[PDB]
Amino acid sequence: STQVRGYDFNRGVNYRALLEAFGTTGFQATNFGRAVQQVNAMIEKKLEPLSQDEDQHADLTQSRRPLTSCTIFLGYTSNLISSGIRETIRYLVQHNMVDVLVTTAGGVEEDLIKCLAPTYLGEFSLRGKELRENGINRIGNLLVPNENYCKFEDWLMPILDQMVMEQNTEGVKWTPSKMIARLGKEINNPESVYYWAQKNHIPVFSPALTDGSLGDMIFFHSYKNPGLVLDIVEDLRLINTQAIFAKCTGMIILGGGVVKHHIANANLMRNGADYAVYINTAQEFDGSDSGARPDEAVSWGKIRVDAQPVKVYADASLVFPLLVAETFAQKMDAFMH
Amino acid sequence: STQVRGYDFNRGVNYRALLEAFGTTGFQATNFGRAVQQVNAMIEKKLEPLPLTSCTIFLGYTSNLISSGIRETIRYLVQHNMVDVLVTTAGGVEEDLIKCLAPTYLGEFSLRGKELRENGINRIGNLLVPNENYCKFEDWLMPILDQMVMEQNTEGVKWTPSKMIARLGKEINNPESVYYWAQKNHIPVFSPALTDGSLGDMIFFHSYKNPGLVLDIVEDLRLINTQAIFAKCTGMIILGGGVVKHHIANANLMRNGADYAVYINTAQEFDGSDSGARPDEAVSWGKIRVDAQPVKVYADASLVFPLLVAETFAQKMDAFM
Amino acid sequence: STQVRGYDFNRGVNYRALLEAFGTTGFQATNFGRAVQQVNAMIEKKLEPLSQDEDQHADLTQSRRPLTSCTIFLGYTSNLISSGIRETIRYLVQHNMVDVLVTTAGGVEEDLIKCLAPTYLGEFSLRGKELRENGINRIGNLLVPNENYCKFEDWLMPILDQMVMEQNTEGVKWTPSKMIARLGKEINNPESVYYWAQKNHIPVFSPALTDGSLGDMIFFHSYKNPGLVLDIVEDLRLINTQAIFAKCTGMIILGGGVVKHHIANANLMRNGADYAVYINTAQEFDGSDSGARPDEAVSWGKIRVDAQPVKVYADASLVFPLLVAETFAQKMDAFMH
Amino acid sequence: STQVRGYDFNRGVNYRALLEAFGTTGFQATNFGRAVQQVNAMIEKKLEPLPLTSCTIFLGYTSNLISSGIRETIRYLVQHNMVDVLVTTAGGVEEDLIKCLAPTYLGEFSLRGKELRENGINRIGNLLVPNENYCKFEDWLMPILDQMVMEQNTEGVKWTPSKMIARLGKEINNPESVYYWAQKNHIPVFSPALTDGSLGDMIFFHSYKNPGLVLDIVEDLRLINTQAIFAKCTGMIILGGGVVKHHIANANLMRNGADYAVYINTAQEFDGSDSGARPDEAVSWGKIRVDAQPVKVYADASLVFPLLVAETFAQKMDAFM
Ligand SMILES: NC(=O)c1ccc[n+]([C@@H]2O[C@H](COP(=O)([O-])OP(=O)(O)OC[C@H]3O[C@@H](n4cnc5c(N)ncnc54)[C@H](O)[C@@H]3O)[C@@H](O)[C@H]2O)c1
Ligand SMILES: NC(=O)c1ccc[n+]([C@@H]2O[C@H](COP(=O)([O-])OP(=O)(O)OC[C@H]3O[C@@H](n4cnc5c(N)ncnc54)[C@H](O)[C@@H]3O)[C@@H](O)[C@H]2O)c1
Ligand SMILES: NC(=O)c1ccc[n+]([C@@H]2O[C@H](COP(=O)([O-])OP(=O)(O)OC[C@H]3O[C@@H](n4cnc5c(N)ncnc54)[C@H](O)[C@@H]3O)[C@@H](O)[C@H]2O)c1
Ligand SMILES: NC(=O)c1ccc[n+]([C@@H]2O[C@H](COP(=O)([O-])OP(=O)(O)OC[C@H]3O[C@@H](n4cnc5c(N)ncnc54)[C@H](O)[C@@H]3O)[C@@H](O)[C@H]2O)c1
C-alpha cells in the first residue's frame, strides 16, 4: 500500500526523480508510472536470451527478424505521424526496439511527405474557408501546404509505374505491408520511419492503405497506368503469424480505431498478449472499440487474463516522448549491444 | 435571431413538438435541430427530379453501432433505398450477419473480462456476445468462402470488400440484415480493412484449408470515388469517426466537397485526431464545400440517430415508395 | 437476459414506442431506458401514501412541504438554466414533482434575467473579441446581451436595499436559499423557476451564490449600502436535515461540480439515497468528483449499497426533456390529483 | 512559421531538452509549450520592480488535485510566495489538512463501492481514503471550531471562508500543508462553498454541540474582487473547472480582464459548461483582456502541472528567495 505523494520541488528540478514521482501522484500520473513499468517489463523480457525450446518455436516464421524473447507491437493513429511523435517513433524503429508496426494510411504517407516538405504548427481555430483559399490543409493545430502533396505526387507516380510493372512482369503480389516496405526503401531518408522499418525488417501493416493521399495517388495513377492490386488477405496472415509464433508479446498502442483492434486481434490468435500499454483519448461510454478499457480485451482473449494492462487517458503527443524517455531510451546500449 | 426556449410540458406531451423544441434549447439540443434540417435538405434535394438521384447520400457508421440496436435503424434506411453508399468497418459488416444467426445481449460496462472469458462471453461496451455466436458464424461462412475461392479461380472473379459484402448479404438472405437489403437495392458497401474482425479470422483460418482468396482494396477505392465524382449532389451522414468518416469525406473531396454533411460522434478535436476534427477542418481540405453548412452533434449515436431518423427519413416514407 | 434490438421504423414513427426502444438499443440509449425506470421508481414511491410510522418520522422537519413517501433532489449546473432546460425544470417545480433544488449562482440569476430579457442562440465558434466589441456575452452556443444584466441591475438593487434593511431592522439572517426564495417572490413571474419554487415551498441551495452576476450586483451594491451577509452554515444544516428526515430519497443530478456533490453528500447523512440518476458529460479518468461513477458514491455511503443508480453520459439539453417526457410528465394527473 | 519536429532520442536523454521539444511536437504537446511561455511571462512581469507585485497571480485548483500528489506541487509555490491568491473548493481545503494527520493511498478506478464501504474505505478516483482519516480530522477540528465560535461571540470575529482557512492552516501548523504556508505568507484562500465537504460535515455536527457559527461569503467576494481590481498585472493559472475557474476569472473581470491566463482542464465545450469553455469565451465577457494570449491544455493536471512548474516557477527559485 503506497501513499499518495507528489514530487517536492524543494529538492530542486531533478527531472529523473520528477518523472518517477508521477506513479505516486495519482489519477493519470499514476497510470503513466504504471505504463512505464509495463513497458520496461516488455523490454526486460525482450532482452532475455532465447532458450532452445523457445528459440525453436519463435524460429517457426519465414521473417528475417532476429527472434526475441518478446515481440513488441507498436501502433499509432495517422495524426501521430503528422505530429513530432514521428521522431519518437522513428527512433524506436531505427534501433529495432519494436518488432511490428501498425498504422493507418495517413500514418504511412505523411512520414514520406515529411522527407519532401515539412508540416507547420498552426491553430485549431483557423477557419477552413480562408485556409483552403490559401492552399493550406489543417490537421489539428498543424498545417500542411498543398504543395506538400504535389511533391509527393512527383516522387510517388514513377514508383507506382515500377510496382505495376513488377506486378505484371515479375509476378509480384502486392499488399500494404509490402508496398510500405518498398516506399520506405524508395524514400531512402534516415529521418523516415519506414525507411528504417524496411532496413531493419520490421513489417508495417495498414489494411486500409487506400484511405489517404497515398490512396489518392494510387487512384489517379490507376487511370494512366491501370492494374495495381493490394491484397489485404495475405497481410492478415502475415500479421497473425507474427503474434502466433511469439515467445512473448507486448502491445504499445497509441490512439484507437483500426490500429488498436488490428494489433490486439492479432494477439488473440495466440490467446492474449503478455503486456499491454494504451495511450489514447477515447472513453468507453459510446461503446466504441477505441474507448474500450484493456479489461474488455481480456474478455475476448486479446490480453491474457494474468496480464496487468495499463491505459493512460491522455494525448500521446504529451505522454509518449516521456514514456520512451523512461523506458526504451534508457536501454539504448542494450539495443545496440 | 432566435430566442432560447425549451419545451413547455404544460402543453402535455406531444413528441413531435418536443423534438422540435430541441432546436431552441441550446448546446447539443440545438445542433440536433440543425442536423434535422440538414438531413431534410439532403432528402428534399434527393427527391428533386431529372439509378442516380438528384443527391447521392453516403451513410457511414462505426462497427459498434451495428452491435447496438442502431442496426435496425440503418437496416430501415437501406431497406427503402433512402441512402446510396454505405461505409462501415469490418465489425459493422460481420455482426449484422451474425445477428441473423444469434442475438447480442445487454450487459454492463463494469463486467470483468476474466469471469466473462471463463464463461465464453465477449464484451462490446455494455453489450454481450456469446462465443457460440461466432461458431455459428463460422459454420455459415466457411462454405461460402469455398465458392468465392472457386469462382475466383474458375470464373475470374476479382474479389474486393464491397463485392464480398454484396455476396454475403445475398447469402445471409434475411430481411433483418442491413447487407441483405443493401445488395438487393444495389447499395454498395465499402470496408477497406474488412480483415479487421471475425470475418478476417474466418478468412484467415479458411485460407489454410483452402488457400488463395484475394481481396483487392484498389478497385473499391475507384468504385467509391467514382460514386462521389459523378454525383449531382452529395450528402454525408457519418455516425462515428475513424476510417468510416475519413473514407466518405475523402471520396467527396474528389468532387470538390460534399453539399451536405451531418456528423454524430463522440470524438473531440484536442487530440488532433481525424475522428475528432470539426466539419470546418474538412472544409480546408475541400471535403465539404465552402458554401455548405455542416453540423456535428457531440453525442452517442445510439441516442441521437433513431431520433434524427424519426424526424427526417421516416417522415418521407411515402416519397421513398 | 434481453436481446439487443433497435426500434423498427417499418412500424412507422410511433414516438412512445421509439423511446421505449432505447433501453434495448445499447450503449447510452440503454442507460437512458434505465434512467427512465429509476426516475419512475422514485415517482411511484413518492406517490405512495405515508403510513403512520413513516409520516411521523418525515414530519420531524420545520419545513412546510407536504411530506412525501420519497424526497426528490434535483440538481443542475448553471448553463442548463441558460438553456431551454430552464422550461423543463420550471415545469417540475411548478407542479411540485421535486422537493429540493440545488444549483450554482448562474443557475439562479439567469432564471430571473430571462424574465427581463431573452437569451439568444449563437455559435460556439464566435470570437470573443468581436462579441465583446458589440456588448455580447457568450455562453456555449448561446448569446447574452450586456443590457440583460443592466436590466437585472435596475430590478435587483432596490431589493438588496430591502434585504439589508430587513437584516438590520428586522434581524433577518440571510442565507442563499432564503435570498433565492425572496428573489423568486420578487420576480413574481410564472415563467420563473424560483418564483414557483418559493410558492410551492421548495428550497433552493447554492453555497457559492456569490459566484456570478448576482455576486457582482451584491458586490457593487455593498458599497453604496454596506452590510449584507450570506451565511452558508445555516443552509448546510437546512439541506442536510432535508435528507436526514426523509422516508426515501431520489437524486436527479444534471451536470457535476458543487451541485452534484452537495446533493449526494447531503444524502450521505441518511446513509445513502434510495434512487439516483445522473446525466452529465464528465468522465472519471481525471479523478474529478464530477466524472466519478455512481459506484464511487456508494463507497462513501452517498448511495445505498442496494440501490441501482444510473448515469447517462450525455448532454442534458438532449436527454432531460426526454427523461421528463417519459416519467414525470406521464404522471401529470397524479401530481395535481 | 515553425516546423513540426519531435525530440530526437538519438541525442540521448536530456529532460530539459525533451520538455522543450513539446512546443513543436503539436496537438496538446504544443499547447504545453505555449503554457510554459505564458507562465514565464507572468513570472517575468511579476519580478519587475516598482506586499503588492508587478503582477498578481491567481492559482486555482479542483479539490481532487489536493487529493493527488499535486498537493506537493501547489504547496511548493505557496511556500515560496510564487503565487498571490489561492482559490479551491471545500475538498481542496480539508484534504490538505487531513494529509497532515493521515495519508491517502493509491488504488484503482474499478474497485467496487460496496466492498470498499464494507471495509471503511472511500474512493477518490484511483485513490483511497480510510474512514479513520476523517475521525482523526474530527478530533483535531472540533476544539478549533469551539474557539472560532467563542471568538466570534466574545471577540466580534466575522468569519468567512478565507478567514477560517487562514486559521486552520495556522492551526495545522505543519510545513507539508499548503494552507499552513498560505497563511504564513499572507496568501489568501477563497472557497465560497466551503460547506461542501467533510469540513462542512464537521461544521454541521459541531453546530449541534455548540451552535452559532456563521460563515459569510459576501465579505470574501469583496476581498477577492479587490485583489484583482487593485493589481498592476494579473495572471490566472487554473487547474480544473467549476467554481474555481469561474470565480478567479470573474474577479479579473472587475479589472477588465486578466493579463495572462493558462488553463489545464479536461473539460470540453460542447456541453455548454463554464468548465469546458475555451479561454476565448472568457474574452467576450471581459475576463481575459482582448490583447492577451491565453492557453488551454486539454489534459489531466496530475501529469501536466508538475512539468509546467519544473519549466517555469522552479527555474526561478533564486529570484523568489
Ligand atoms: N493524420 C491524419 O489526420 C490523416 C491524414 C490522412 C489520412 N488519414 C486517414 O484517416 C483515417 C482515420 O484515422 P485514424 O483511425 O488513424 O485515427 P483517428 O483520428 O480516427 O483517431 C482514432 C482514435 O484514436 C484516439 N487518438 C487520436 N489521436 C490521439 C492522440 N493524439 N492521443 C491519444 N489518442 C488519440 C482517439 O480516441 C480517436 O477517437 C486513417 O485510416 C487514414 O487513412 C489520417
Ligand atoms: N463493434 C466492434 O467493437 C468491433 C468488432 C469487430 C471488429 N471491429 C474493428 O474495430 C475497428 C475499429 O473500430 P471503428 O473504427 O469502427 O470505430 P471505433 O470504435 O474505433 O470508434 C472511433 C470513434 O468513433 C466515435 N464513436 C464510436 N462509437 C460512437 C457512438 N456510439 N456514438 C458516437 N460516436 C461514436 C468515437 O469518437 C470513437 O473514438 C474496426 O475497423 C473493426 O475492423 C469493431
Ligand atoms: N451558465 C453559466 O455558464 C454561468 C453563468 C454565470 C455564472 N456561472 C458560475 O460558474 C460556476 C461553475 O459552473 P457550474 O459548476 O454550475 O457548472 P460547470 O459549467 O462548471 O460544469 C460542471 C460539470 O458539469 C457537467 N456538465 C455541464 N454542462 C452539462 C450538460 N449540458 N450536460 C451534462 N453535463 C454537463 C460537465 O461534466 C462539467 O464539467 C457556477 O458556480 C456559477 O457561479 C455559470
Ligand atoms: N476531491 C474531491 O473529490 C472532493 C472531496 C470533498 C469535497 N469535494 C466537493 O466536490 C465539489 C465539486 O468539485 P470541484 O468543483 O472542485 O471539481 P470537479 O471534480 O467537479 O471537476 C470539475 C471539472 O474540472 C476538470 N478537472 C477535474 N479534475 C481534473 C484534473 N485532474 N485535470 C484536469 N482537469 C480536471 C474536469 O473537466 C471537471 O469536469 C467541490 O466544490 C467540493 O466541495 C470534492
Ligand SMILES: NCCCCCCCNC(N)N
Ligand atoms: N476476432 C475478435 C474480434 C473482437 C472484436 C471486439 C469488439 C469490441 N468492440 C467494442 N468494445 N466497441
Ligand SMILES: NCCCCCCCNC(N)N
Ligand atoms: N486525401 C486527403 C486526405 C486528408 C487527410 C486529412 C486528415 C486530417 N486529420 C486530422 N486529424 N485533422
Ligand SMILES: NCCCCCCCNC(N)N
Ligand atoms: N463527507 C463526504 C465527502 C465525500 C467526498 C468524495 C469526493 C470524491 N472525489 C472524486 N471522486 N474526485
Ligand SMILES: NCCCCCCCNC(N)N
Ligand atoms: N459576472 C459575469 C459572469 C459570467 C458568467 C459566464 C458563464 C459562461 N458559461 C458557459 N458555460 N460558457
